[PDB]
């Protein structure tokens, strides 16, 4: 993969309401993050061109965020089934920015009897064995 699965799971699990994650979810996300990076970068490079530069810069990313409606959840990083209606979507972005501080990226154990069995069990070379 071009993006590390475990690190994706970590960011997902910083939401306390997340319990378990299917094995596809990180795999899917790695590919979706890729598309998100390509789109974000593509539109940022426009602003660099408009400004007659060869170097992509923070303020280019900011311009792309500002120009691109569905990127408005990202307005904090650069200070100073159907799609939701712009207004419905707007409320979900506001609730997301409301919840953003409560995110904790420290390791938390969610299933203790699993940890109990994992620390008592045979390992060939760190690995679980039969």
């Amino acid at each position: 993969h071009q993006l590390p699965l475990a690190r994706i799971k970590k960011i997902m699990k910083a939401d306390e309401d997340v319990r378990m994650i299917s094995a596809e979810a990180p795999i899917l996300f790695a590919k979706a993050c890729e598309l998100f990076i390509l789109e974000l970068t593509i539109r940022s490079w426009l602003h660099a061109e408009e400004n007659k530069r060869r170097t992509l810069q923070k303020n280019d990313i900011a311009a792309a965020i500002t120009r691109t409606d569905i990127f408005d959840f990202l307005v904090d990083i650069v200070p100073r089934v159907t799609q939701l209606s712009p207004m419905d979507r707007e409320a979900r972005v506001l609730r997301y920015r409301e919840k953003r501080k409560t995110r904790k990226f420290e390791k938390t154990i969610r299933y203790a009897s699993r940890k109990a069995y994992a620390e008592i069990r045979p390992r060939v070379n760190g690995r679980f064995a039969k």
Binding site: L3, M20, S22, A25, A32, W45, A48, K58, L74
Partner: protein
């Protein structure tokens, strides 16, 4: 740590740019932070769909549902193809 590794983000950015192009340190850092927000934004919305349906495992269709909902529809069709063709 709350970010994906800046080297990997940097590799993907370069694929969207011309060969000429150069990328500043702060542009890498900004994109790196945005990707993490993307995950959190999608994951929170998928997490709510799971609670409402009284399920406890976030699955791929929950992500795809959130992406359509929050306006990333353009990713959904490629992702479903990506699902199956990887899955073998």
């Amino acid at each position: 740590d709350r970010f994906l590794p800046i080297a990997n983000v940097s590799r993907i950015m370069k694929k969207a740019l011309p060969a000429n192009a150069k990328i500043s340190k702060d542009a890498k850092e900004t994109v790196q932070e945005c990707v993490s927000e993307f995950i959190s934004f999608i994951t929170g919305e998928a997490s709510d769909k799971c609670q409402r349906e009284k399920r406890k495992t976030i699955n791929g269709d929950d992500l795809l549902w959130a992406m359509t909902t929050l306006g990333f529809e353009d990713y959904v069709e490629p992702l479903k193809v990506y699902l199956q063709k990887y899955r073998e």
